[PDB]
Write an enzyme that holds these catalytic residues in place. Sequence first.
Site, PDB file in Angstrom:
ATOM      1  N   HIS A   1       5.276   7.398   6.176  1.00  0.00           N
ATOM      2  CA  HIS A   1       5.054   6.683   4.901  1.00  0.00           C
ATOM      3  C   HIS A   1       4.578   7.656   3.849  1.00  0.00           C
ATOM      4  CE1 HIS A   1       1.015   6.770   6.706  1.00  0.00           C
ATOM      5  NE2 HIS A   1       0.658   6.982   5.450  1.00  0.00           N
TER       6      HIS A   1
ATOM      7  N   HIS B   1       2.670   8.889  -0.113  1.00  0.00           N
ATOM      8  CA  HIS B   1       1.616   8.746  -1.141  1.00  0.00           C
ATOM      9  C   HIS B   1       1.975   9.549  -2.401  1.00  0.00           C
ATOM     10  CE1 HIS B   1      -1.320   7.103   1.791  1.00  0.00           C
ATOM     11  NE2 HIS B   1      -0.722   7.924   2.632  1.00  0.00           N
TER      12      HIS B   1
ATOM     13  N   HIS C   1       0.808  -1.221   0.000  1.00  0.00           N
ATOM     14  CA  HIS C   1       0.000   0.000   0.000  1.00  0.00           C
ATOM     15  C   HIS C   1       0.847   1.279   0.000  1.00  0.00           C
ATOM     16  CE1 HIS C   1      -3.316  -2.646   1.267  1.00  0.00           C
ATOM     17  NE2 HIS C   1      -2.667  -2.941   2.380  1.00  0.00           N
TER      18      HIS C   1
ATOM     19  N   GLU D   1      -2.466  13.189  -1.093  1.00  0.00           N
ATOM     20  CA  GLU D   1      -3.822  12.871  -0.686  1.00  0.00           C
ATOM     21  C   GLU D   1      -4.586  14.164  -0.470  1.00  0.00           C
ATOM     22  OE1 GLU D   1      -3.453   9.628   2.426  1.00  0.00           O
ATOM     23  OE2 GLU D   1      -4.358   8.742   0.657  1.00  0.00           O
TER      24      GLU D   1
ATOM     25  N   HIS E   1       3.409  11.252   5.360  1.00  0.00           N
ATOM     26  CA  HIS E   1       2.600  11.285   6.588  1.00  0.00           C
ATOM     27  C   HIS E   1       3.466  10.770   7.705  1.00  0.00           C
ATOM     28  CE1 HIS E   1      -1.369  11.052   4.154  1.00  0.00           C
ATOM     29  NE2 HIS E   1      -0.889  12.272   4.254  1.00  0.00           N
TER      30      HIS E   1
ATOM     31  N   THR F   1      -6.430   7.835   6.573  1.00  0.00           N
ATOM     32  CA  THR F   1      -6.799   7.813   5.147  1.00  0.00           C
ATOM     33  C   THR F   1      -6.769   6.420   4.558  1.00  0.00           C
ATOM     34  OG1 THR F   1      -4.570   8.214   4.216  1.00  0.00           O
ATOM     35  CG2 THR F   1      -5.865  10.178   4.826  1.00  0.00           C
TER      36      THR F   1
HETATM   37 ZN   LIG Z   1      -0.791   8.182   4.690  1.00  0.00          ZN
END
Ligand SMILES: [Zn+2]
Lengths: 225, 225, 225, 225
Positions: free
Chosen positions: B90, B92, B65, B96, B109, B176
């Site tokens: 981590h 994205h 993920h 986001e 994040h 999220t």
């Molecule tokens: Zn995140």
Amino acid sequence: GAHWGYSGSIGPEHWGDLSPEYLMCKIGKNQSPIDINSADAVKACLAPVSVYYVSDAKYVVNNGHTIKVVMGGRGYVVVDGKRFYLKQFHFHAPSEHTVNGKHYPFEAHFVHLDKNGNITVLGVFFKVGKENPELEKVWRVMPEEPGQKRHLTARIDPEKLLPENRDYYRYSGSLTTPPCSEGVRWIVFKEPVEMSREQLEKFRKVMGFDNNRPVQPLNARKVMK
Amino acid sequence: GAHWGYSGSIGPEHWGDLSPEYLMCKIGKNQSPIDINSADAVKACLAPVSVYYVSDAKYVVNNGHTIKVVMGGRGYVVVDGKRFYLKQFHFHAPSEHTVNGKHYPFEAHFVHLDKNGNITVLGVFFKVGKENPELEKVWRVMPEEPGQKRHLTARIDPEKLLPENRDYYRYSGSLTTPPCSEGVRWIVFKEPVEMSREQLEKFRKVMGFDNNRPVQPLNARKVMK
Amino acid sequence: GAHWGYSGSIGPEHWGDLSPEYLMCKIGKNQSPIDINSADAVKACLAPVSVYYVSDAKYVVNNGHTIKVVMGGRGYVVVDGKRFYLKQFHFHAPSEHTVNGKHYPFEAHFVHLDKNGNITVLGVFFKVGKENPELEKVWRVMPEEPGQKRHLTARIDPEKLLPENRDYYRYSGSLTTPPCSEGVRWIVFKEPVEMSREQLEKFRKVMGFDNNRPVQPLNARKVMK
Amino acid sequence: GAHWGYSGSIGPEHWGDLSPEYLMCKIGKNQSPIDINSADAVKACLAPVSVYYVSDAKYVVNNGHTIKVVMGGRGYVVVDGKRFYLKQFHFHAPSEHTVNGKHYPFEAHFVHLDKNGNITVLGVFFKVGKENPELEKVWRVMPEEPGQKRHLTARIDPEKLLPENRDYYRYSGSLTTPPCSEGVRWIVFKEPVEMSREQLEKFRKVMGFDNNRPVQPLNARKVMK
Ligand SMILES: [Zn+2]
Ligand SMILES: [Cl-]
Ligand SMILES: [Cl-]
Ligand SMILES: [Cl-]
Ligand SMILES: [Cl-]
Ligand SMILES: [Zn+2]
Ligand SMILES: [Zn+2]
Ligand SMILES: [Zn+2]
């Protein structure tokens, strides 16, 4: 839904267990009412909330949980650039919201829905002092028993129940009665309004019990002031 | 829990249906991420968020993920007068959160838990520009396949990944990713950090798909700025 | 008054002694320009400053101190609920105001007077970038001799010189040229606008020297942001 | 300097002509006191003003203008990250500052100077109520003749004269007595403190006249709240 109340097996601490519809009462992290204090509030550039109420009351009802005046839905406040239409207003003793850990003796909620069903509640604290002429229009025909409705003869001017100073606290919370739905905009006026000893006593005696939900954890929220 | 992802029958619009544990994903009114814009933000007297991170990284993992660096939990930020300990950070791509309806290409994040399990996430936007020396320490050993963990040899200084200007947006939201739990404090830094074209490309190729949850309705909330 | 310039015994450091009407320029505690930095600025709920300019330019003049466009006085801005009418605007290279100690290549000033003679200046920073079409309307007819006035062959729309984002810094300040009068409302816009390097070069050559007064002590003031 | 009072050709309206060093008192644009109202005040992220007073009172003096307690200069307040040392405090009846056009019966001023001579005054409003024990320490030895000094038989703790809530209004202002010097930092506390009617009566009788200067034009300033 299912029968709920303020004491015993159907009291607030149990509401989430009474009906599938009431799950938010127990799983919600953004619930109302709250304590408003120095540690949880932050100075913010909050927009004036303008009020455009009309005299379109339909009736007053004692529903076993509160005394509520049902409105026609023509009048509105402006919040976040949108019109939220006044549907009803109703009352709690003692107050549901607290300030610095202290209750006011009485709190009125003015419940508004926008075009899409989103809810805004305006909260007004009352302190004991001079008799409230606007409140008296409703009080003089207050239904004494649950399930009773009375037609209101005097014209109701809900704006006259708001404080003269319109400064407010704002936070994102919930309905304070089942189903305790979230996504509710709360606008809680800082300045209390006065009511007489006699007016407060009449309400409390008619109700016969305190009809306030306990304050809920702030969790991730800030109260804006 | 149950298997979830970013496309098809297990994509974000379906997460709330995949496991009883994931109900908030669909019933929540205070979900993350959001669009941060002029109509939803309000100037507020937000406290400085002070950072006291340490070099206690354990490993980097590709979990299918995201790419995540797991920390020891010794370092912390101070929010609402309390220490929230850095557990993991981590990434994205694309971002986001959006600002004025626009994505940044990448968002980090930093996930923190206080003594009682309450969560604070610090979000940092990245734009393409100069190579990021701190990010490279992780990128040079990025696990290429889901389920792989790599021991990190270089000492990780997570503070060096934050922007120099520490002004931020704050709102109350949610995780999220499933279970999308609410009561999450979000601290999203206004100033983006730079990463190279090559660093961004490496992450996107390793992932192979966009791993951002769609923005969610603000509902009753204000974003503080 | 008397006489003044930007170098030697007529330069900014000396203006204060050159006349008893050039007094505030040394006894004054509220002078402009200033450095706008983190230490001296406070986040504040500043009202939007609405702009209602009209195309009533009369002439462009090289008065030896700047390049100036004199307006008919019909357009205005609204500050503190009062109308302040645009009398003239003019230019400085490099910028007079600094942000965090750093100059912009160029600064425009728009000078307003209300009905009772009170002054408001709007300030706009320019960075080097794409050619500025509104500025070019003035540049193509720029006069070159102290005392020389020239007619504008194009319609001047001064609002097109302002940034799209109208957020601003505000303080109680002064004129940046003798008689360096105080009680001036300063509205300095945060977002700079672009001009060409060729555009900057022309003004600097026609001017021949830096026409910016050094920054002045903040004293008891805060800058509002 | 010269000479001054509160009536006739020596009263506040005339101070400005009585000496070339009493100049700002007519040419000044930043004078005190002021009316603090809705139109002139702006919500702002004001830093807490921390107070660190010590008991170094030297004498209490009736100088014909007020009743004044002179301090050793060791205690201080922190404003803008700088220390401003308490030199003296004194009293006015009725209040000099007004809130929404209305006077308080009584106002205390605490006068501070930093290392470089810069002045900060803290202002405290008094309403009629319960007897003020800290004030009584000074009252019981109040001197009665212009020029008369008296020794304090009790330990003076000036911080006990301040309200419990330390929220305040702030502006760039002046001394409220000639030479009516500007560049004074004003910190006026919002919450009034109580004194007895007997306490107010004594000061008013010993003084014999109102010793408050009328409010002055706000000009280009905003009051921060
Ligand atoms: Zn995140
Ligand atoms: Cl707002
Ligand atoms: Cl905060
Ligand atoms: Cl303003
Ligand atoms: Cl401040
Ligand atoms: Zn209610
Ligand atoms: Zn200028
Ligand atoms: Zn005084």
